[PDB]
Every structure is written in C-alpha cells, then in structure tokens.
Amino acid sequence: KHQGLVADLLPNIRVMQGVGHFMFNYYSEGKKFPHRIYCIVTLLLLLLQYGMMAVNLMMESDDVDDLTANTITMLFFLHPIVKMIYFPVRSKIFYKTLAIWNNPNSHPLFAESNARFHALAITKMRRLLFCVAGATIFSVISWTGITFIEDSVKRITIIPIPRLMIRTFYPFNAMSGAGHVFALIYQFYYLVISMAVSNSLDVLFCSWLLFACEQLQHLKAIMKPLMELSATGLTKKQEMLVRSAIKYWVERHKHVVRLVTAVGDAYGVALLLHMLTTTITLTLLAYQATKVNGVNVYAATVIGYLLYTLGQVFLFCIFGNRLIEESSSVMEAAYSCHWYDGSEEAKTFVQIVCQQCQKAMSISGAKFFTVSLDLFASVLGAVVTYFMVLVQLK
Amino acid sequence: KHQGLVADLLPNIRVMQGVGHFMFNYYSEGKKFPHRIYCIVTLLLLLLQYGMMAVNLMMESDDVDDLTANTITMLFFLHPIVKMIYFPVRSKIFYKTLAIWNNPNSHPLFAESNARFHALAITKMRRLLFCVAGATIFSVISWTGITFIEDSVKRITIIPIPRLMIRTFYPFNAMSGAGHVFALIYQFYYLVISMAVSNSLDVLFCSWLLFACEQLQHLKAIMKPLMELSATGLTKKQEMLVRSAIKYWVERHKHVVRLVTAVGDAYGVALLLHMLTTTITLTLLAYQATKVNGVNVYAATVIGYLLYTLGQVFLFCIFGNRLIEESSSVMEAAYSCHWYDGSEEAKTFVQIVCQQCQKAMSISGAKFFTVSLDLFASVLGAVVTYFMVLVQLK
Amino acid sequence: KHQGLVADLLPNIRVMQGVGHFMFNYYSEGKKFPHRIYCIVTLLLLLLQYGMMAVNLMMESDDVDDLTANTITMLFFLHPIVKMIYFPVRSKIFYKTLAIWNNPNSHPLFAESNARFHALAITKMRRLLFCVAGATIFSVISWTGITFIEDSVKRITIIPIPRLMIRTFYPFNAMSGAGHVFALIYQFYYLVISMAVSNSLDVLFCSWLLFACEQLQHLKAIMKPLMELSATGLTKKQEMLVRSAIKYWVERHKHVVRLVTAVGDAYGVALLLHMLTTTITLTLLAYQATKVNGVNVYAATVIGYLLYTLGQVFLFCIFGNRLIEESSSVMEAAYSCHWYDGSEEAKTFVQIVCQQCQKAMSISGAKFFTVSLDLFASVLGAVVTYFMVLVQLK
Amino acid sequence: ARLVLHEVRYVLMAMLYISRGMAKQIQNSTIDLYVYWFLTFIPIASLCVPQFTYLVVDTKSLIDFISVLVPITEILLTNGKMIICNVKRGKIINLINQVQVAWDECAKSEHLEIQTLITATAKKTKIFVIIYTTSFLLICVEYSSMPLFKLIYHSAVYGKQSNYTIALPYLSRFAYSTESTTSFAWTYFFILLGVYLLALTLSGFDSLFATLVMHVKMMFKVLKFEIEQLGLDLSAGKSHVELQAKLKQIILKHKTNLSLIEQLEDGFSFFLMAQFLTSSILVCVVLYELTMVFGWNEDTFKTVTYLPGAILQLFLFCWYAQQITEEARLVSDHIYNIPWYLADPKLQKDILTFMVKAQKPTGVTASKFYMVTLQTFQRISSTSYSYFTLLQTINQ
Ligand SMILES: Cc1nc(C)c(C)s1
C-alpha cells in the first residue's frame, strides 16, 4: 500500500478485502489471521446459500418456466462464486500485475506530463469505482423493492409462496415467523456480497486498463515536443539529449506493453468463463422475454436481468476498446509531429514506432476472442436474432 | 458564408434552413428572430402530425398486418424527427466542423492543382445535392399518385376509409368536406418537410466526405511531381524547396485527417441511430414482403419502402467506401513515382507516408460499425436471410 | 535416422510404421520387403472392416436415427483411411519436409541457446506424443467399456442385436462364442489401428509446428543480445562480427520459413480434407445431441463423439495459433531491444525484420482457411447455433 | 510473335468484337463498336425478351418457373457480359496490347528459364482456351439445337411416314405468330445466331480473363527470376551503383505488373460482381432441376452437363483471383530471401520501401464490395445451397 499501482488502486483493494476477496497481501501481518477467517466464513455462507438455491431448482424442475428462471438465477449467482474461487488460485499473477509499476522511468523534461496524467488516471479510477458501486447499490435496492411490490403467489390453484428476494428452499419455516426475517437479512447480505465481489474484480480489471490508456495518452502528449526537441548541426549534447528522450519514450512504451500483457494473462480465463456463463444466461433470457406481455412485474424482472448482464459485458468491452483505440492512435500521434524537420535518428525512431503501432494492443479471452465494442455488438445481435427466431418459431 | 467549406456548402445550408433545420448561424442577425420562430412552428406541426399518427397506431393495433404497416410508417417518419432534434443539441460540433477549412495550407507550386480540385469538389457537391433533391421530389410525387390510383377501402365487410396519403386519426371529418382537402395539403407539407430535412442532413454528411476525397485526390496528384522536384548534389535552395513541399504535403494530409475525425465526431451517433431504426424497419419490411402476391399496389408500396431505406443506407456506404478507397490508394500514388531517384529526405518522406497509409480512414457509427459497401452488403444479406427464414418456418 | 528432424521425431516415425503407415525409408533394407506386406495387409483388413460397415448402413437405411448414427460412425472411420491413403501418394513431399533441417546454420555466440531450445523442442514433442497416445488408449478403453456395459438391443419389439463394439453385418454367426470373440478381437484391432494412424499423422504435423515455434523462440532470445553486440563508432572487427550475427539470424529465420511452407503444403491439403469431413460429422452430431434426454449410454456416446471431433480440430488449431503468435512475437521482440543505441546497419536490420514479421506465418487448408483458434471458435459457434435452432424447432 | 491470347483473339474475331484481332497493336474502332452493339441487340430480341415474357406470363407453378429460370439466368448474364465488355472495349484492348508488349520484351531474353516460362505460358493459354470454348459451345449446342438433330434423325430413319412435329428450343413467348413455316424458320435461325453469339461471348471473355491472369503470373515469375539475379549479384560483391540500378529495374518491373493488375481489376470489377451474383442462383436452380428430373432422360443429360459448367465457371474466377493475390504477395518473400544484409543501408531502405509496397494485398474486387479470393468459391457456393434448401421446403 506504498508502491505505485497499489497505492493508486488502494480503495479498490480495500473494498475487495472488505467483501471477502481474500487478498492477504496489503496490510499489517497482525490482521492476516482474523481477516482470513472472515473471508472463509463469507465463502461458506455464499456456498451455503447457493446450495439451498440448487436444491430449490431440483424440486422446481417439473415445469419449464420456473426451471428457466431458476437456471437464470443460478448462473447469475454462479458468476461471483467463480470469480471468488478464481482469484486465490491465480493470486500469484494478480500480485505480479499489481507490482508491475513499482519502478517506472523518469526524464526531467517529461516529468510534469507524467504527473498530470497519473493524477488524471487516479481520478478516473475513483470515478469508475464510485459509479460501479452506485450501480450495484441501485441494483440491490431495486431487487429488495421489487420483491415487495410484487405479489408472492404460486400457480399450480393459488399457493402462498414465501415473500423472499431469492427463490430458495429452507429447512425452517421462512414464511411468517422469525425465519422469515432471518431469511430476508441473509438474502440481503448474500445479494450485496455477491454483487460487490463480482463488480470489484471487474473494476480492478477496468482500472488496470484505464491506467494503461492514460499512460498511452501521456506517451503521445510527450511525443509532440520530442521531435521539436530533436529538430534544430546538432551538437554532441543535443544528440545525447535526443537519444535520452527516445530511450525514455521507447522504454515507457515497453513498460505499458508489459502491463497490458500482465493484465491479459491475469484475466483471460476470467473473461472466457464470464462470457461462457453469459451466453447461456442470454439464451434463457431471450426465451423469458419471449413471454413478456405488458408492463407488469415479469417484464421488469426480465429487463433488469438483461440490463445487468449486458452492462457487465459492455463495461468489459468499452474499456477493451478504449485500450485498442489509444494503442492505435499512438501512430497518428507519431505522424502528427514535425518529423520532417527532425534529425535522421528521430525519423528512424518515428518509423519504428509507427511500425510497432501498426497493430493495436488488446485483451483476449484466452485467445478465443477480444474485448471490444465489436464483441458487445456481436453479443447483442446474437441475442436479438435468437429472440426473433424464437418469436417466429412459436 | 464567406469562408471555406461553408461557401462551398452554402446551397445545402440554405436548403436546410428553409426546411427548418435550425442553423441560426450563417445569415444577418436581423433574420435570426423570424426564421427561428418559423423553425419552431415547423417542428410543432411535424410533432403534431406525428402524434396523430401514433394515436392512429393505438386503435389500429388489433390486427397484425395494420400494426406492422403503421410501425413501418412510424419508423420511416421517426427518422426525420430524430435528425431534426439531433442537430440543435450537437450544433457545436457541426459548427466546428463547418469551420475546419477556414485556414488551409498553400504552396505556390501546388496552387493550381488545389484550385482545380476544389472546383471539382464544389461541382460534385452540387451534383449530389441536385440528385438527392430530385429523388426526394420523385418519392413525394409517387406517394401522392399511389394514394389516388389505389382504392381507399378497409377490410373488417368493406368500410370506406378516408383517402389520405398517410394513415392518421383526425378530430375533424377528413373524408369529403373541407377537412379532406386540409388534411391532404397538411400531409403533403409533412411529407415534403420530413424527407427534405432527413435527406439534407444526409447530403451534408456526404458532401463533407466528397470534400475529403477530392482533397486526397489533389494530394496524390501533387505527390506525382513532388519527387520530380526532389530528384535532380542538391544546392541549399533546392533542399529547402523539397522541405517546403514535404511540409505542405504532410500538413495537408493532417488537415484531411482532422476533417475526417471531426465529421466522425459530428455524425457517428446519427449513423448509429439511423441504422438502429433501419434494422427494425427492414425486419418489418421483410415480413411485409412475405405477403406479396402479384403486381398490385401493395407490392409497389413495399418495394418503395425497401428502396428508400436501402437507398439511404447505400448512399452512406457509397461515400464511406469512397473515402476508404482514396485513403488506401494514397500509397499506390506514392509508390508509382520515381521515389528511388529522389534525395534521402524525400525517400524517408515516402516511406513514412506509406507506413501511415497502411490503414484507411473510415467513418464509424459510434465505434460499432464502419460505413462501407461491405456494411450495405451485410445489411442486405441480413434482410434477405430473415425473409428466407420467415418463408421457410411458416 | 542420424540427421535432424528425423532423429528428433524418430519415436513418432516408428509408431507410424508399426501401425502400418507405409514409410519405407528409415530402416535397413532387410526390413524394407517384409514390412511392406504387413502394411498392405493392415490396409486390406481396414478396408474390409470399413466395407463391412458400409454394407450394414444399407440395411438400416429405412430408419433415420440409425442412419444418422451409422453415417457418424462411417465418417469417424473415414478419417483414418483417408489419412492412410493420403500419405503414400504425397510421400515425396513428406520426405522432403523431414529432410529440411539436416544442415542448419551455426554461430559460436548463439550455440548454447540453439542447443537449449532444440532440447526443449524434443522434450515437448515427446510430451505431445505421449499425451496423444494416452488419449487414444483411453478412447479405445472407454469405447469397449461402453459397449460392454450398455445393453445390446434393437427396437423394431425388442430384437437382440449382437453385442459388438461396432455395428456391422457379418457372414459369421456373430452370436455364438467363436464368431463373437473373433468379431470382438477384430474390431478392437481395427479401432486401435485406425485411431493410432490418424492421431500419429496429426502428431507428426503438430510436432513440425512445435519445432518451428521453438526455433522462433530461439530467434527472439538470441535477438535480444544481438543488438547489444551491435551497440557500442565500431572497429572493423566489430562491424564484421555484427554482420555475421545478422546473417545468422536472417538465415535461420528463412530456414524456419521454408520449413513452415513445406509443412503448409502437405498438411494443408490434408487439413482441407479433414475439416471437410469434420463439418458433416459435427452437423450430424448436433442433430444427435438434440435427442439426448439424460440416458447414460446415449448421452455418453454423443458426448464422446463430440469430444473426439472437437479435440482433433482443437489440436490442429492450437498449434496453428501458436505458430501465428510466435511470428507476431518475433516482431514484438525485435521492437523490444536496445536498437536506439545500435548502429544504422542494426537499426535497418530491425526495421526490415519488423516489416517482414508484419504478416505472421500460418498454415492454410489449401488456401480455403487458416488453422487457428479463430477457426475452432467459428466451428464451435456454428455447431452450437445450429443445435440451438434445431432444439427450438423440435 | 503475336500468339499472345492467339486462340482468344480468334474467338473474339469470330464474334466481330474485334475486326483486326491478329494485329500486334489491336486498334479500337467505332465500326466494331456499332457492329457489336447491333450483334448485342440480336440476342436480346431472339432470346432474352421472349423467354422473359414467357416467365412473366405463362409460368404456372414453381417447377415451370425453375425450368424457365435455368437457361434464362445464364442467357441474361451473357447479354450483360456482351454489354459490359462492349463498354469497356477500350480498357480491354489496352490491357491486351500491354500484355503483348510485355511478352515481346520477355521474348528477347537469353535466359533459358525465361524461355521455358514463355513456352509453358503459351501452351497453357492455348490448351485452356480450346478446352473451355469446346465445352461451353457443346453445352450451348446441346441446349439449343436438339430439336434440329431430332428432326434430321427422324427424317433420315422414318422418312415421311412417321410424324414428328418439330418444336422450338427452350420455351418462350413471341409477340408475332410462329405457326407458319417461314416465320418458324426465321425465328429458329435468329435464335441459333443469338445462341452462337452468346456462346462465343461467354467462352471468349472467360478465357480472356483466365489467360490475362496467366500472363500476369508469368510476368511475376520473371520478376522473381530478376530478384534472384539481384541476390546473386549482391553475393558476388559488386559496387553500389550496379545494385542500385538493378533494384531500380526490378522496381520498374514490379510497377508494370501492378499496373497490369490494376487494368485487369478496372476492366473486370462489375463483370465479376455480376458473375458471382448470377452464379449464386444458377448453381441452385440447376441442382434443383437435376434432382427434379433425375433419370434416364434427355433433361438429365442436359442438366448433368450444365451443372459442372456453371460450377467450373465460378471456380475459374475464384481460383485465378486467388492466383493474382498470392503471386502479388510472394514478392515480399522473394525480396526478403536475397542477402540484403550485405548491402549498404541505403539500398536496404530502398528494399524496405519495396517490401512495404509488396505486402499490401492485391487482386480483383467484386465491384469494390470485397476482394475476390479462393475462399469466395465457398461463400457463393454456400449461398447457393441455402436457396436450394429453400426450394425444397416450398415444394413439400
Ligand atoms: C443454356 C444456355 N444457352 C445459352 C445461349 C447460354 C449462353 S447458356
């Protein structure tokens, strides 16, 4: 919590630890023992609750509609469990990534721009964290409200089902007694914890991407005066200064590439698993939306599920696309300087930089796809086409 | 209306203002007050009539065929409303774009080619404007004829429907009395104004693209003798002349790049919304075409709707593809000269220009797609595939 | 036997020869005559059983489910026969490929890394061979176990079909002890031989790819110190040393390119055939999976067929993608060295190397596609979408 | 000497497309332009208009619609090719003349490899043209002139005893009556004339495209030989000026090949677009007809001969576009293989610009929509299959 890229992300790390994302690395050793226990307990509770959800699916599988809804809920709440189990097994690469920017470069002429863009990156990270936290809080509040405005009724004949936020089978009578209130509190805690863990891991990924993009912006901004520094023949001191500036630019670009590669290695399998779960969730959600008739409770629930799923996918894709665009635009920033008035060494440096920028940095889901607005467009088109086919067939 | 890129587009700006596309920027201040009022009035009328269509769609939703036809009409006439509201909110970027070419570059040796290609661009813009205006007028006339040759009858039993160009519910008896003629004139006005506003904004976008393409053509034409100027050792004056020529070429290319970026910024969301509305329009039109049996009026109306929608898409895609092809062909132009007899500086200039031209400038719909003939082909194939699925599943 | 690329792959060559895969080139002439007959006999037996299966497909042609199952089996067992016949006709190109690396370049400075990466490649080849052999043995054992646990019964009424591992019409009784045991032994031998032939040819292809990838890794690793050798205004001795190092790098890269081209020719035609068969196999398998309802034997068989087909495709695709990414990484490693400190010759060498590496090496199925994880993703998406549509149609 | 596209020149002359085809500098003349326009309008009257009138008037089911659409698709595409190539005659003739000039330049070389290339290309051109023209002329003769052969056979065998009421070729509706013997004979004569013109158009233009692609490939191989000579010269250790001049000449040859490819693309863009659009439907309709009337019938024979013709017609353009693309691409590999590391950094930078240009994809687009490659053959084919399945669903 002192070195770069962890001090900057410290609020995110603290949130992750608070909700139970393990992370026994960035506090005093004294807290290592108690905190760990808490984390384990949370996981247990999560799995515990998850268990009674799965059981509820087993005896609710007679019909198709209830089975579909239970499966959608199960995938929705499988997401956070997968993320929570995924982090500790791959904690080594995560800690390596968080320590990548502990020793960056420095040049006297470009220090001010570096500081400015670092501050900008920190502000953007905090803004993203707050926005995602607000979205999670709004989702939880909406869930709690909707479970109450709606009528808890089961169609068989009319059977009073317990008024609970999440369908679940409980050994005790969770209808009117103290079991009801206990189930309410437990389900509220489960919802908050699961949503928070999932969104916190996602925000950590997106904040890594934000840092990389701001570093690319700094690289372009300082590319602008580097050529002017070279152009002016040149004395030995001036040639040495140009060489040092070129070295700084190239080494910082290599550092950004290293950070991007580390992030990709850390999160590729997570992205692949997320999209694998999503595909099925969206298929079942298209089937569910096929049955929407009106502006009643069912339509609201289906729209909320679709919005949350597509929002997760869209967040990943927007930040991936931002990285791609910045990496590509490095080339335009290299072309837009007065390279024709520069020296031969500077012109060769510009040529090689453009050569390298011919291809844009991107994050891939374990080499099966890439995260970009194109991926989100493809997912949305696939779900819409499946919905249209489902409407036509019936 | 005195500087570049606004004097060139002045007929388009005047047409936009006359049809009510706001634009309170390019006339004497005295006209600012009255014209504005007129614009507002136009919008009101549009929305008014639009509302009366939506009302007509509410009580015409009992059937599926009439509901589909009403939805197609509502989307068709939503296009112009969306464009008309879109311009004023984004007027800042539009005005920034129109003022981009106020201070362009100049070199004595390339002045004649610059003037020739500017004149060619102006002529092409005027030709495009006239062609689109003629197409709009033909569409209006065809609508006003088809409303009359056909028989105004409703199937319930036969119910004599009022003979109007556009289906609509009117508080007054718009069948035989003065209400009939008033409704006919009002619908003629609505059709003319809506088509005019939509097509005028589209033509402004395409005129920007035409200007960019002609500037690229000028760049290649002057690339041809630039090397001849370089190849000829060289005295200081000749080296300075080559430096000035290279500076002119690079800066003009960068200006074209800036213009393309500004146009994309201005019109990306507009393209995205246009394609969003189109997709649904084409889906409903495929369903409508599924019911075509003969060469009667219904077939003519369906064909007209399809032709108009695909024509808008095709215009956008044609000009996007033209921009892409010109930007790509810049490198073929750069290679075909005698770049091997030039000086070292000119050879590095050609090298870096080719590296930059490895990629082609393009306009994207808010980063979700690019405008090209490939996009038109994909849309056409999608609609054809949906029609095939509709006919097969039934 | 005593030359590169055949001394490294010798165990795979011996495994190929043992199963009756021709290859009358890498042993003493004394065994040249005997082995040949064995090979022919194997083919005969193979063809025999193959024909013996095809005849059965006729009798069971009346129904549609058994027709689909028999077609799936026929394509599965078509793969190995196609490979076995394909090798001898194209044997000359195979032998040319296996003799590519007899005389490679050598430099005193890069000998240690070359030896290390050669040993690494040999180890990885051995690991791949052992893994694929284990997978094939497991497949055979699981096939036999499935046949023995599952009930052999035909639905017409229940008519007891012979309990044989592969459906086939036999002149023998196929029910009494002698015929039953003979058929079981013959089918076990047939399965082992077919699986071994197909998988061994595939493993030879993938081992060629592994060698190419390891050579590319060696090229990058020794590229890193090459520039530091260049970087130091050099005495003639240093200039000559740098030239020799650059020559070694370029010649080794060209050698790798030649190897990739030969492998591409041979197994590109082979891959075209393989994927042409796999497409129909996967379509029929999706139709079969549409009928799964939790039954252990049926679901297990369908899952096994899908797993085997997708595993073959995935193996080809993973190794092709590794080759592509290795070439792109050659580009990246060229960028990420201290070229700014080098001499103009070294900088130009880096520029040309990066320009060449802009286009990554790949293996194409006779110019009809490229083997990569993108191809596997396309195959999986197509089959999954087809299955979804099919199950909805039911 | 002028054997460049010799058989194609003969086929073009037989069309009256070009009058003095066998010249070394084929000249564009207005007389040929107008004569070819009249000959273009002859098939429209004889074939396209009557068949389309029958299609939009007398068609009474899906089977009849497909039967009428099997020949008319190719007839309309061939008329379109007539018009397109008449419009582009200037570009086509300029391309042929430039190919002839390049061939004359190459034939002056003393290297045995180049001479072998020349002989192989000439033989390939002749064989391909002959085979293609023969196959498609036979297809057209079988489709159009069968009733005449049947009438001749019946007259020879049965004499005047038996009766065989002759009927016109593929169904059509004519504005004027054809019951009278004279009108019938004149209509049949003009139908045969139009069929001959269409067959020659299809054969000659397809062979022209394929043969021009072959010659472009040969010129690329000559450039490869020149690059290898430059590499050998680099190894030999000559002066900087000599290598500079050799690289300049190689660059000029590369530019000439690129210009030839550009002219071919300009000439055949819309041609290829229309060809693919038509083949997508033609293959499907012919396959459906084949499955509808499979058996021991004349219709089965005609359809079985027709289907491979259309499939190979599509594969011709796909394959040769792929050849253009790959041959253009391989120049970067040919320039990378020379020992450029032995050259001065200036020549290395010149080689780098050469390779930057040589890596850009090149080929013939389908009217700017996409570049044509071998994979396209799959795409269009798959599309055809789609339509085919659709038809089946409509029947049952
Ligand atoms: C069946 C066919 N008849 C003609 C005249 C073609 C060009 S094709």
Numbering used by the authors:
A (entry chain B), B (entry chain A), C (entry chain C): 4 to 159, 168 to 243, 313 to 474
D (entry chain D): 2 to 397
Quote the original article:
Most insects, including human-targeting mosquitoes, detect odors through odorant-activated ion channel complexes consisting of a divergent odorant-binding subunit (OR) and a conserved co-receptor subunit (Orco). As a basis for understanding how odorants activate these heteromeric receptors, we report here cryo-EM structures of two different heteromeric odorant receptor complexes containing ORs from disease-vector mosquitos Aedes aegypti or Anopheles gambiae. We determined the structure of a heteromeric complex formed by ORs from these species in complex with a Apocrypta bakeri fig wasp Orco that is amenable to structural determination. We find that these complexes form asymmetric tetramers containing 1 OR and 3 Orco subunits, where activation of the sole OR subunit upon ligand binding suffices to open the ion conduction pathway.
To determine if the 1:3 subunit stoichiometry can be observed with other members of the OR family, we turned to studying the OR28 receptor of An. gambiae, a main vector of malaria, that responds to the natural odorants acetophenone (a plant volatile) and 2,4,5-trimethylthiazole (henceforth TMT; an animal odor, originally isolated from anal secretions of mammals). A different heteromeric OR/Orco complex also has a 1:3 subunit stoichiometry and a similar mode of channel activation. Overall, subunit stoichiometry, mechanism of pore opening and ligand binding of the AgOR28/Orco complex largely resembles the observations of the AaOR10/Orco complex, suggesting that these might be conserved features of this family of proteins.
